[PDB]
Amino acid sequence: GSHMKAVQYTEIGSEPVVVDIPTPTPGPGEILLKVTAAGLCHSDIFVMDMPAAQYAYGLPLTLGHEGVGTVAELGEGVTGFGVGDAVAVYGPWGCGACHACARGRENYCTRAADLGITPPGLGSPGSMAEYMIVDSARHLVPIGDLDPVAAAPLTDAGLTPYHAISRVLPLLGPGSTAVVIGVGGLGHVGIQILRAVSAARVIAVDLDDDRLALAREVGADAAVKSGAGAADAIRELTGGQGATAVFDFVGAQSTIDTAQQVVAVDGHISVVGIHAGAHAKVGFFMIPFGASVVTPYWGTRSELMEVVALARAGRLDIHTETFTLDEGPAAYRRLREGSIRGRGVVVP
Amino acid sequence: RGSHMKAVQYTEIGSEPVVVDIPTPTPGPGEILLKVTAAGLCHSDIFVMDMPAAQYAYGLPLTLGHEGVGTVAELGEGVTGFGVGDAVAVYGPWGCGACHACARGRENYCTRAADLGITPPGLGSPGSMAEYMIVDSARHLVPIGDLDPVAAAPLTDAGLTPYHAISRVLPLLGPGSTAVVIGVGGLGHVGIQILRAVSAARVIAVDLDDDRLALAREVGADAAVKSGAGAADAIRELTGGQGATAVFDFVGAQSTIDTAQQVVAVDGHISVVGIHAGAHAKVGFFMIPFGASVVTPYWGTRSELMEVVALARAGRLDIHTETFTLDEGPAAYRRLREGSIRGRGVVVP
Amino acid sequence: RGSHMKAVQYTEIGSEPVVVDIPTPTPGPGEILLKVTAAGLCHSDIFVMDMPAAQYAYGLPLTLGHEGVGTVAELGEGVTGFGVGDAVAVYGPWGCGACHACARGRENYCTRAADLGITPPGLGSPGSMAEYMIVDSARHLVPIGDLDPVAAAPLTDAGLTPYHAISRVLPLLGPGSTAVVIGVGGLGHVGIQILRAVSAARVIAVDLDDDRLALAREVGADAAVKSGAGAADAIRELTGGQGATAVFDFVGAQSTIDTAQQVVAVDGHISVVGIHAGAHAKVGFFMIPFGASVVTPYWGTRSELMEVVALARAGRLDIHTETFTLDEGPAAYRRLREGSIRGRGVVVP
Amino acid sequence: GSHMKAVQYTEIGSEPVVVDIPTPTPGPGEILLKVTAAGLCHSDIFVMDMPAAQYAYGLPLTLGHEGVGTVAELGEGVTGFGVGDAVAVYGPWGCGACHACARGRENYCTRAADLGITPPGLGSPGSMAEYMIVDSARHLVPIGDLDPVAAAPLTDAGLTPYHAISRVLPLLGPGSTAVVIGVGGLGHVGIQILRAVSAARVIAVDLDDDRLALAREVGADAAVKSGAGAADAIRELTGGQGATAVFDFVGAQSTIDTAQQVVAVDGHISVVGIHAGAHAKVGFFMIPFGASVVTPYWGTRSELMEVVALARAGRLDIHTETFTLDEGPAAYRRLREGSIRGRGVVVP
Ligand SMILES: CC(C)(C)[Si](C)(C)OCCC[n+]1cccc(C(N)=O)c1
Ligand SMILES: CC(C)(C)[Si](C)(C)OCCC[n+]1cccc(C(N)=O)c1
Ligand SMILES: CC(C)(C)[Si](C)(C)OCCC[n+]1cccc(C(N)=O)c1
Ligand SMILES: CC(C)(C)[Si](C)(C)OCCC[n+]1cccc(C(N)=O)c1
Ligand code: NA
Ligand code: NA
Ligand SMILES: [Zn+2]
Ligand SMILES: [Zn+2]
Ligand SMILES: [Zn+2]
Ligand SMILES: [Zn+2]
Ligand SMILES: [Zn+2]
Ligand SMILES: [Zn+2]
Ligand SMILES: [Zn+2]
Ligand SMILES: [Zn+2]
């Protein structure tokens, strides 16, 4: 087909729409995928909530930064993959040539911004379409016979918490404690990751009673209600020592404040969730000595392969609700209203 | 038949239509009285009732309904051609019948109707939204046979108007041509079906709403893109940069007209069918491609209305309908104003 | 045909239904897969979805739609009696098929369904509001021939339920008898048409709206009176104090039941068809005439559904319908909640 | 067992023989029964005395339309019974989808003939074999711990008179009179049914004093010898008012004439027995006003359940003579010469 359906953001402040666009063809080094699953998440809502005042360029944009597909056509010179191979799309594309990229950490590429290299669905054409172009073979990760619908959330919902945890994994030995604030999406996956790759005690923190109960099912050793009393309740559980690491998947100022009140000396706070303007306050006597704080970004290539390995070993379970490509906009409406249980996945 | 009838009338400016109790008309010589079987309502009725009172000169009261269908009730003196009970659709844009335009069949472009005060039913003359109505002459009736009156009523406007616009330039729409339809509401929805039935042109739809884009594909649009600033680029993306032989703008907003001028092909056509007061195409050198003609078409001809009925009876035209009673008349208009009707509302006595 | 299909499901207690993408079912041995052509909605769907969470056991997720019509898409192993393409309506109140009541055709009164967990489609089993549905057995399909599926769907409930209630005492409704119909909404006005088609009983209608009384007269009611404290006297005025042979209360409120007991004749009948939680007739000496039986009937039998279909195909039954798409499902149920639908809403995949 | 013994009618004009045939296997929706009792009735002889032109049940034919057994194997998708359940077979199979079938009256199915649906032992394989197939679960009726030998006659010898009586049961109130002509196979059960489901007086009519004596034991209030004097005798026993209902299980022209001579105004005559060419003459002044006549056929499924309920309550006592499967053909010779006391039953 000379044209294909794509879920696109086409004007500021509007809803995504299913529109017909030319079917792309892979240039030298590129790979054309037939999309099999395209995950959606609140990051898409955040991008689509950006005001017009800040807008400079990017429209129209094919959505979808959580992409899985089968190789449909290989660009000239591409080897290492064959037509039909099931692959997940590595999201945070880098230049491949800087020191950070050479070390595998393309998500921290120091040249991507200058070169205008943007992730699919966030500046480059995304995966919510019948077909999609991938710029380079090194951004394809094989998934074998893993269900594409289960693999799609792993590209973001699994990779991002896995990276945040991986940054300080050597600290999470037996006797350590990891606090997870927000146990619904990324945090639910984070708890499973923590139980698979460490022996740390896991304390779940959330506003909803039901989410906390589900957090215990996937390995959380204790549960705490988010809010003003959370810090004291957490210290009650850890004794007077505090938490080795706090992974804040909410990112609100109140949750960041709680993290600073419970993190242990020489600990770590990871601000994964995004709330505009919210920030940790790292200064003497405002945070324990040696407690580092960071805003991590997505994850590395090898980390995505490790997430796929966890999923294929049965250590990662992410509940998904499926939609057709025609229902792309409907799925985003459901996402806004909070009626999606699990992670939405578009299946073209 | 009784001596009084229910009717829905615009009775005073700025007010909503109301059900009333008026006498049953009687057919004079050459006239025909019909038992209305379906009376379609349309946003054009809304446009008329939105007329500011400062513009008002005369007209009220006015039985609404310019999309009329019914069965012959009583033949006026000397009226041959139809027998009582014959199912007929009412041709809307009444003309004088004697000028050059009328003699060619194009009564919608009659050059004397304005001077003579000849007005269409429901838009100056007693409309179809009543138990009976008067049709001035036999030539303003089109037989429909066993066609469902509810299916026929919307096609007197939602079918005839796009059909005429398309017919004006149909010879240009051969195989290999591309026709763009902006606005996939009632008019554009049927316009796409017409294009597929009477031509081999590729149809590309444009609309604001995702569900209307999906509707366009269902009824034969090969492709559909969202209206707005990027609409012209998205169309030329699908055509390989060539541009459309014809653009039928059933919205008529200035932004949609702008899009049409940016995608129409050299020696093409733009048809401004939808009305937005003040919106206009700007036909000038280097502001529109060479040879691309622009027009604002008006309703359609009688022979075209017959062709629309033949298309409908062959199963080539479909429009979603919502049936109401006369007492629900005003309620249907409020539903129309709030934009909750998909397709066309139709009042069934 | 597609490995996945669209459906409208009730997924959370207190939450509106949503469109979902779920696997296309495959018919097992003895089952039949239908391509749905129409799926009706009615107030009973709201009653179910309004149930509090405290009383929730295991029903979710539930594909809604207990008024199903479609065409046979695939026959399960060993199924005979229908061919691919046959138009059929779905019999709602599924039973075990093996008890005495089932062997008599009265599956709606099966004495084993509750113990065995046999639930109707859309009320425990996957309903008809989807592109495809499974029917457990060929004995729950009723051929409809060329009957319009949109007209057939509401009659699986709105026709069958009054038809059964009337059929329970049809021998009493001979010439000279009087049948009172309370509530001329969906079920009641179909009930009026049934009474006129299958009996010579004089029909008196009772309703609140003045508009409903006129409609009752149009569809066959010989007389109509206003519901309220004066309805009992008004009815007895028309019957001369003899009382009404049968009273079919399609409202089911306590006040309407009280009026029923006040007008029902000696040796007559009251049928409490409408549901109002807690409302009940009081059957005791000198609180109701001697010999006047009272019952709360439930849906109808399979042979009765066959007879309802035969009445519809003979043009004796008519219910106003309003069609929606599967994507419009949730919006249609909202329309029903606010009481904006006249007649019955029908979802057409 | 790959094969099984069966009593089959293999050629026109010959006696049934015990032959070996493949053991059937149940298809989807079917049930395989291990037969525990198979009854013989004169209808089998009538079928076997048909000339070549009239016979339309195909050859070979496994005989036996009075079948009872235990569920041996369930066809695909058959729920409702378990292996080992004792069940009686409903004989007059119908389409299950016509108006008559939907009302439970499968015996009066209007499409069975056009569709080739025939009863077991009368077009379909019968019960006089080690195993038999039943087309559908709805044609099985549980019997509990009822003795299969006593249960087999209930499927025809009980069901058929029960249906004939049920057609006009509302007429047989206290003060009514029911005349039973032929108190052998079916009339013996008819007398017991009448006493169980009605208060009508029962007058027995038969040729043999032996048969009349038994009729009086099972509830017949009076006995009359069949012949030209029966009509006068019956009216003498009822003054001159007549019999509300006459159930003629002989079906001969002479007995039908006796029925028409004794039936009451607005009464009923049921011609249950079959004698080719015999017929009632329903015309003005040839029969009392309002006296309806009918030839009933077998019975409905709900009536079979009611017959089973009567037997399990001790209300039906069927006189049986048991035979082995190898004795099958011999039993039919016994039935031919009228040397069987009551009902013959083969027990495989
Ligand atoms: C939140 C960002 C500003 C980085 Si955004 C809208 C460009 O995320 C898209 C990349 C997916 N994802 C989702 C949530 C969190 C993160 C993370 N903490 O890296 C990444
Ligand atoms: C208010 C309108 C300007 C649309 Si009026 C009063 C000309 O519509 C009545 C005739 C029906 N119809 C509807 C839409 C468009 C046209 C057309 N392009 O002719 C005609
Ligand atoms: C079992 C349910 C709780 C869903 Si009920 C009783 C609201 O109806 C479902 C069956 C449809 N219908 C609608 C109205 C009345 C009746 C009736 N009188 O049988 C039946
Ligand atoms: C009905 C048939 C003509 C095929 Si006959 C009599 C050979 O047997 C089949 C059913 C067996 N049975 C025996 C006795 C009486 C009756 C009855 N009155 O129905 C039925
Ligand atoms: Na536009
Ligand atoms: Na009342
Ligand atoms: Zn994401
Ligand atoms: Zn780099
Ligand atoms: Zn119009
Ligand atoms: Zn003119
Ligand atoms: Zn219903
Ligand atoms: Zn049952
Ligand atoms: Zn027999
Ligand atoms: Zn049948």
CSV table of C-alpha atoms in Angstrom, one decimal, chain A residues 3 5 10 14 17-22 329, chain B residues 202 210 213 217 222-226 237-238:
chain,number,residue,atom,x,y,z
A,3,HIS,CA,-0.4,5.0,2.1
A,5,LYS,CA,-3.0,4.8,8.8
A,10,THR,CA,-1.5,17.5,14.0
A,14,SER,CA,-6.2,19.1,19.6
A,17,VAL,CA,-6.5,11.6,14.9
A,18,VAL,CA,-6.2,8.6,12.6
A,19,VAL,CA,-5.0,10.0,9.3
A,20,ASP,CA,-3.6,8.4,6.1
A,21,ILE,CA,0.0,9.2,5.2
A,22,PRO,CA,2.5,7.7,2.7
A,329,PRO,CA,-7.6,8.4,19.8
B,202,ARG,CA,-9.7,9.2,-6.1
B,210,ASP,CA,-11.6,11.6,13.9
B,213,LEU,CA,-12.6,10.8,8.9
B,217,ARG,CA,-13.3,5.9,4.5
B,222,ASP,CA,-9.4,6.4,-0.4
B,223,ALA,CA,-7.7,8.6,2.3
B,224,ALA,CA,-8.6,11.1,4.9
B,225,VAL,CA,-6.6,13.8,6.7
B,226,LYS,CA,-7.4,16.3,9.5
B,237,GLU,CA,1.8,14.1,0.6
B,238,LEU,CA,-0.8,11.6,-0.5
